Amino acid sequence: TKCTLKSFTVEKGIYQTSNFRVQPTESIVRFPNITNLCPFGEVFNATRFASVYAWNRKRISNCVADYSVLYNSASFSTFKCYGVSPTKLNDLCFTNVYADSFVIRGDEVRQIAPGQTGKIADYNYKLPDDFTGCVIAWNSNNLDSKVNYNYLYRLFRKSNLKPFERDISTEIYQAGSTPCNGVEGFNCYFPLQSYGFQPTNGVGYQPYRVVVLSFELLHAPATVCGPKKSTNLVKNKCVNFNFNGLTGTGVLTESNKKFLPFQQFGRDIADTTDAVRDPQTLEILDITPCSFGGVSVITPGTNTSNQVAVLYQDVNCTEVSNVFQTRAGCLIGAEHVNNSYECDIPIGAGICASYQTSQSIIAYTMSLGAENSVAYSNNSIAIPTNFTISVTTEILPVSMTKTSVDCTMYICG
Amino acid sequence: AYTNSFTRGVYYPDKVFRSSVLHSTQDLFLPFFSNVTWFHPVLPFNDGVYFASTEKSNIIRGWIFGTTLDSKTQSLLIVNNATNVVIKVCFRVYSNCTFEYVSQLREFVFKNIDGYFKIYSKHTPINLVRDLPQGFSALEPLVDLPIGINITRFQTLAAYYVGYLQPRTFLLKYNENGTITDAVDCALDPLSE
Amino acid sequence: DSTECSNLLLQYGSFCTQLNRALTGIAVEQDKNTQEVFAQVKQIYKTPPIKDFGGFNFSQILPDPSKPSKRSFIEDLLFNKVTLKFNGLTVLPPLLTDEMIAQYTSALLAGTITSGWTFGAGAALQIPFAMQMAYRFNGIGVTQNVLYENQKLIANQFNSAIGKIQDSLSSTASALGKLQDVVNQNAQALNTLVKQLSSNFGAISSVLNDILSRLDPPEAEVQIDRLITGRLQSLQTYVTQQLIRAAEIRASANLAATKMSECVLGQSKRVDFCGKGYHLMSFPQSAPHGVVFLHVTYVPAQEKNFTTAPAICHDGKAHFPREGVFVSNGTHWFVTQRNFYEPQIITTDNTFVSGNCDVVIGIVNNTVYDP
Amino acid sequence: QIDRLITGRLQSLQTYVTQQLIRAAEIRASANLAATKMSECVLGQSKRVDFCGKGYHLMSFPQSAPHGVVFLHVTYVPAQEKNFTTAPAICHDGKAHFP
Amino acid sequence: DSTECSNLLLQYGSFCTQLNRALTGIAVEQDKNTQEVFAQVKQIYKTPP
Ligand SMILES: *[C@@]1(O)O[C@H](CO)[C@]2(O[C@@]3(O[C@H](CO)[C@@]4(O[C@]5(O[C@H](CO)[C@@H](O)[C@]6(O[C@@]7(O[C@H](CO)[C@@H](O)[C@H](O)[C@@H]7O)O6)[C@@H]5O)O4)[C@H](O)[C@H]3NC(C)=O)O2)[C@H](O)[C@H]1NC(C)=O
Ligand SMILES: *[C@@]1(O)O[C@H](CO)[C@]2(O[C@@]3(O[C@H](CO)[C@@]4(O[C@]5(O[C@H](CO)[C@@H](O)[C@]6(O[C@@]7(O[C@H](CO)[C@@H](O)[C@H](O)[C@@H]7O)O6)[C@@H]5O)O4)[C@H](O)[C@H]3NC(C)=O)O2)[C@H](O)[C@H]1NC(C)=O
Ligand SMILES: CC(=O)N[C@@H]1[C@@H](O)[C@H](O[C@]2(O)O[C@H](CO)[C@]3(O[C@@]4(O[C@H](CO)[C@@H](O)[C@H](O)[C@@H]4O)O3)[C@H](O)[C@H]2NC(C)=O)[C@@H](CO)O[C@H]1O
Ligand SMILES: CC(=O)N[C@H]1[C@H](O)O[C@H](CO)[C@]2(O[C@@]3(O[C@H](CO)[C@]4(O[C@@]5(O[C@H](CO)[C@@H](O)[C@H](O)[C@@H]5O)O4)[C@H](O)[C@H]3NC(C)=O)O2)[C@@H]1O
Ligand SMILES: *[C@@]1(O)O[C@H](CO)[C@]2(O[C@@]3(O[C@H](CO)[C@@H](O)[C@H](O)[C@H]3NC(C)=O)O2)[C@H](O)[C@H]1NC(C)=O
Ligand SMILES: CC(=O)N[C@H]1[C@H](O)O[C@H](CO)[C@]2(O[C@@]3(O[C@H](CO)[C@@H](O)[C@H](O)[C@H]3NC(C)=O)O2)[C@@H]1O
Ligand SMILES: CC(=O)N[C@H]1[C@H](O)O[C@H](CO)[C@]2(O[C@@]3(O[C@H](CO)[C@@H](O)[C@H](O)[C@H]3NC(C)=O)O2)[C@@H]1O
Ligand SMILES: CC(=O)N[C@H]1[C@H](O)O[C@H](CO)[C@]2(O[C@@]3(O[C@H](CO)[C@@H](O)[C@H](O)[C@H]3NC(C)=O)O2)[C@@H]1O
Ligand SMILES: CC(=O)N[C@H]1[C@H](O)O[C@H](CO)[C@]2(O[C@@]3(O[C@H](CO)[C@@H](O)[C@H](O)[C@H]3NC(C)=O)O2)[C@@H]1O
Ligand SMILES: CC(=O)N[C@H]1[C@H](O)O[C@H](CO)[C@]2(O[C@@]3(O[C@H](CO)[C@@H](O)[C@H](O)[C@H]3NC(C)=O)O2)[C@@H]1O
Ligand SMILES: CC(=O)N[C@H]1[C@H](O)O[C@H](CO)[C@]2(O[C@@]3(O[C@H](CO)[C@@H](O)[C@H](O)[C@H]3NC(C)=O)O2)[C@@H]1O
Ligand SMILES: *[C@@]1(O)O[C@H](CO)[C@@H](O)[C@H](O)[C@H]1NC(C)=O
Ligand SMILES: *[C@@]1(O)O[C@H](CO)[C@@H](O)[C@H](O)[C@H]1NC(C)=O
Ligand SMILES: CC(=O)N[C@@H]1[C@@H](O)[C@H](O)[C@@H](CO)O[C@H]1O
Ligand SMILES: CC(=O)N[C@@H]1[C@@H](O)[C@H](O)[C@@H](CO)O[C@H]1O
């Protein structure tokens, strides 16, 4: 109070020294059950894959994708992502998600990347230069090699494939001047070969299953978003909370108000969130702003003593010598008395505090005045037999200081 | 064969809940006392549309929404069926599938906002036939699909009223429960103004 | 509770200590208003156990112990007539509780009933209520015998007049217009102040966490600055509205204090200050945010035409009325008090003699009986 | 930069002059009350109760203060009351006598 | 009477409504002032001819 009054001596009175707000603890977040999940399982654990010339594309839509299952798995040889962070898209959404799966061999996995050339990159599967997505591959010798699957790849093509183009035509490739008649011959070759996936092949010659996730993020609606962590709730404790994207700080409590089956969160008046239903358990809670109020000291004046009695306004002080609850707040450091005296320092709610003897600050319900019942009767009169003349002082302000402010010299100078 | 749209034809604007308070909402609504075109075919979709139908034998089936409906561009094809209601972006009536959804007076409100299709429905114990009595009801049981096209056709496959929503503010009174007991139309009348 | 906004606000200056100082000033001014209006009684006066106030009936305006609030019937009616913690807004409770104000008014009412106006001057000196009403009739110009001869009728009129107030308050709606208007104005101000938060104020979004989240701090600073300046402007507007309205209510509270003093504590000769008609007495009742005065006034009725004369010319000298007015019913001349027709024989005792006949114009010959 | 400074200093000067106007209105109310007291309590004797001191007003004197005025109100306060039996009238010879 | 300005003004909030309400309050107060000062007589009185 000496600080906020800019003095080393403060007079007898009650001064609002500061404000006090209970700080929130253990913030909580909640989001509805993850009932619908994205079909990455039927893409990655598909019993049969597809030849690289006829690569399979799976469109991912209207689902929540938990990409952590992909990068937390320890059964991948390569997980190269371009222009996107797989560890950072579990709180991200995409306007479009594609999943391309096929089978190649070891030394050809390096071709599934932007700006590559070769049999696979030019005639089977081409990625764009500005590719945004991940290239995931793993050895599949235990599945695609026996001593009965038949995987194919394209040998020739009259022009290189555009990015994400797919050619499945089995027409005879014309390499020379003479035109083939849909039949193989001189300067005429069938465009597809089979892979020679033998279990005893070298590592670079064994089959590798490849999945290519590609993403798009335009200023357009999105339907593929990852999962959202959720935690348990609390009661009667000022907490920062996140309910279905709505952030707020308060004490959550049980509420008798019933929502309607469609209403999520409610506002009593003045566009202030007052109730909210949790998405998991489908239960309504009332939000109350956790206790806050001005803290004001009561001091009898410095020269009298240095004692003070703190008053935390409108705070039921179950929380931070003798702690006395009053209808104007909580009083810390002031003894409560039963008798009543004339009001000295106005606390509020019909309660005043004063410094009196040993030498303590006492709070009491102020006395309106002395009580007397003047003796009325239908035939009794009280006549004055004497008098006192009395001079009293009435003080009245009549004027102020005639201040004049030069606008320009004050503003600019 | 027009017929004035009465008070009926108002829906819950958003998900929020309001108890015993009056609110003002600014979005598409069906005007009070606006002569809807009772049909007894072909219907446009300039904007969101209030569709209200009465069938003793439930003859009417789902709505075939379409921007062009020439098989060139994707349709919406709401249909309904004893077991379930099926809606696909792609039976007897026909004309690159993007999305399919299957789930479970007769007020119906359909609108497309920023590519999101919204449906509002209500069931009423009608006692007078061939007139929709002025009364109040609304709900928001909906299915949202991000089409992003401007539908222009209905082709509903035994008479149905059809009215067109307009962007005019309303004042909705809210019950203690949170339901919309009543509403008034701001620009309808100077008294309502 | 946003730290970066806290810093950007800090750099503006001492605006908020100033706003807080203005608001706390009007806050303590309100307590001063209530205490000044009601705390004009030195010591609370208990009313006697048995009510025999000369036929007058004060049961309605006197406190009833049966009620838990311990306030009078009309005060509870007035309380029922009116119909009276979100983000940084707090409403401090008034220093004087409603029960304390009811006790103040009960003390004032018991004092004015039992002791008349003596208790305001000093020690409470008790007079029988009939004799005090006679004092007050002498105050308004009517002689005191008029009350005693008509005491039962006056008691019945006062009782029925108090009864009419109960009907007027209970049935007629919007009787407490001014007080309800005060409550509505304060609710309106707080409500619009809270509504201003949703306003965009020219930034990309109103909600501050969102504007913080999806922009870099250098760019977000500008949008946050727009939000801060708009919200600070709205809060400054609310504070200045409160200051002006508090000035107006202070004027009304000073008027209530003056009426409490000049009408409850004492009889006032200022015409139309307290009621319509010559003022007899007034009683205070505690409304929720104000005081309701019941003004007991004396209004004359059933007037009669008379022929009057300025002076009576008898035996060559002019007799003027001491306190009355000469009136003639057609053949005889009488002296009557102006406010109440009570004729008396013209005598030298009640008519003083000055001058002679010729000077004064309009005088009429008659005989002044000499006792 | 000067624009920001101008706006801030202008807002401060504006709120200062508004608070000065309100304080001046309060002081004008007080000065009108003081003029009424000086006219009704010094230039004469006032019957309106508790306007000038507690008790029946005899007279009053003004004294100059730095920014105001201090009235010394001389009032008559009855004291040493005595009980008596009382009656409104007196019956004598079949006539009522009132004081 | 420019829509582009009015749409920007909508963002500021209820300032115009507040100003209109304050001014209309002053307006009705002026009628109240004249009524309180001059309408002290119940019924119009005519001086005798
Ligand atoms: C009227 O109603 O009230 C006034 C009050 O001012 C009253 O006048 C007071 O009378 C007192 C009684 O005589 C007076 O007290 C004494 O004064 C003499 C001086 O004349 C003084 O020597 C006296 O003290 C001695 O006696 C007392 C008591 O025995 C004792 O305690 C002392 O130690 C000392 O031995 O002292 C008294 O003080 O008292 C007051 O001076 C006097 N006041 C004034 C201002 O003159 O006046 C009226 O008598 C009274 N009238 C009626 C009809 O009741
Ligand atoms: C009031 O109640 O009493 C007085 C007192 O008597 C009354 O005054 C009287 O007024 C008369 C009208 O002026 C007065 O009559 C004349 O006075 C003059 C003045 O001396 C006198 O010369 C006059 O007589 C002549 O004229 C009359 C006709 O007027 C004629 O018959 C005579 O024979 C003669 O030729 O005489 C009148 O006497 O009349 C009275 O003298 C005068 N009385 C006195 C004592 O001065 O004053 C008032 O008239 C009367 N007012 C009312 C309303 O009754
Ligand atoms: C207490 C008492 O008896 N006072 C009377 C007083 O009433 C009376 O003056 C009227 O009282 O004034 C009215 C004016 O409204 C007056 O009446 C007129 O009547 C004619 C037709 O008769 C109408 O055409 C006029 O428009 C007007 O209404 O009535 C007339 O002067 C009085 N009315 C009465 C007596 O009924 C005065 C008269 O001098 O006498 C007082 O003693
Ligand atoms: C949660 C809540 O209060 N919901 C309220 C809903 O929003 O509004 C309706 C209608 O205004 C409200 O319904 C009525 O509530 C009362 C009290 O809860 C209900 O009163 C009881 O009814 C039961 C049987 O239902 C009796 O056994 C009991 O004695 C009470 O009489 O009163 C009343 O029945 C409800 N009306 C119904 C169910 O139609 O509904 C509802 O509270
Ligand atoms: C205080 O002045 O008055 C209290 C009145 O309630 C007093 O509290 C009571 O004290 C008695 C005796 O100790 C107990 O039997 C009661 O249970 C108790 N009641 C309550 C509500 O606390 O309290 C209190 O003792 C008294 N204190 C003093 C110092 O006089
Ligand atoms: C909307 C929804 O599906 N909510 C369920 C959520 O997804 O999963 C929890 C987990 O079981 C679910 O909680 C169960 O709810 C039922 C409803 O009455 C209770 O009977 C169960 O006890 C409860 N079980 C648990 C573990 O919470 O919760 C939600 O219903
Ligand atoms: C002038 C007057 O009314 N005097 C009455 C006084 O005010 O009250 C007493 C009360 O005792 C009154 O005298 C009577 O007292 C008996 C006592 O039992 C009552 O029963 C009588 O009702 C009462 N008389 C009246 C008229 O009330 O004395 C005085 O009369
Ligand atoms: C009489 C009947 O049930 N008719 C069809 C009903 O209206 O809709 C469902 C759509 O789900 C229909 O069944 C589907 O038939 C196709 C074709 O064989 C199957 O691929 C779907 O799995 C199957 N769906 C369901 C839910 O059964 O059935 C009915 O034919
Ligand atoms: C002495 C006396 O009779 N005082 C009455 C007082 O002046 O008015 C109240 C209110 O009417 C009066 O109390 C009511 O009296 C009637 C009898 O006519 C009873 O029926 C009522 O119950 C009673 N109370 C109320 C609240 O009306 O009280 C006093 O009698
Ligand atoms: C026109 C008229 O009747 N005037 C009367 C006047 O207004 O009052 C007096 C005094 O009462 C009145 O005269 C008295 O009337 C009473 C009526 O009861 C008679 O008993 C008296 O005899 C009569 N005369 C007197 C008292 O001298 O006169 C007028 O009649
Ligand atoms: C000035 C004076 O002496 N007044 C008294 C008055 O004349 O009589 C009444 C009743 O006798 C009196 O009031 C009672 O006085 C005694 C003794 O002082 C007290 O004990 C009583 O409490 C008091 N009140 C009663 C009896 O109701 O009152 C006056 O003091
Ligand atoms: C003040 O409270 O204490 C001073 C000693 O520190 C003392 O000199 C001074 O008189 C005191 N003031 C009052 C008003 O008593
Ligand atoms: C207090 O605020 O909280 C206690 C536990 O939460 C409760 O028992 C007590 O009654 C409350 N008191 C008040 C005055 O609110
Ligand atoms: C091996 C198995 O049983 N299931 C796999 C799972 O391990 C893998 O995480 C998932 C990827 O979507 O693909 C499934 O087929
Ligand atoms: C020719 C044509 O429109 N092809 C579209 C393609 O553009 C779109 O990206 C894809 C989304 O599933 O659906 C195809 O039918």
Highlighted features:
part of a larger assembly; 5 chains; 413 residues; 25 strands; elongated; binds a molecule of 4 linked components (NAG-NAG-BMA-MAN); binds a molecule of 3 linked components (NAG-NAG-BMA); binds a molecule of 2 linked components (NAG-NAG); binds 2-acetamido-2-deoxy-beta-D-glucopyranose
Write the topology of this structure:
The structure is cut from a larger assembly and holds five copies of chain A.
Chain A: H1 2-5, E1 13-21, E2 28-30, H2 41-44, E3 56-60, H3 68-71, E4 78-82, E5 96-105, H4 106-109, H5 119-123, E6 133-139, H6 141-144, E7 152-154, E8 173-174, E9 188-189, E10 192-194, E11 207-216, E12 239-243, E13 246-254, E14 265-267, E15 273-278, E16 283-288, E17 292-299, E18 309-313, E19 323-326, E20 329-332, E21 335-336, E22 345-346, E23 352-356, E24 360-364, E25 380-397, H7 407-411
Parallel strand pairs in A: 2-12, 21-24
Antiparallel strand pairs in A: 1-17, 3-5, 4-6, 5-11, 6-11, 7-10, 8-9, 12-13, 13-16, 14-15, 15-16, 17-18, 18-20, 19-20, 22-23, 23-24
The site of a molecule of 2 linked components (NAG-NAG) has 2 residues of chain A, from loops.
State the helicity of chain A in percent bands. under 10%
| Distinct helical segment count of chain A | 7
Strand segment count of chain A: 25
C-alpha end-to-end distance of chain A:
35 Å
| Bulk shape of chain A | elongated
SS content category of chain A: mainly beta
Bound molecules: a molecule of 4 linked components (NAG-NAG-BMA-MAN), a molecule of 3 linked components (NAG-NAG-BMA), a molecule of 2 linked components (NAG-NAG), 2-acetamido-2-deoxy-beta-D-glucopyranose
Oligomerization: part of a larger assembly
Q: Using only CA atoms, what is the Rg of chain A?
A: 42 Å
Largest interface: A-C, 36 and 42 residues
- Give the biggest sheet of chain A: 6 strands, mixed
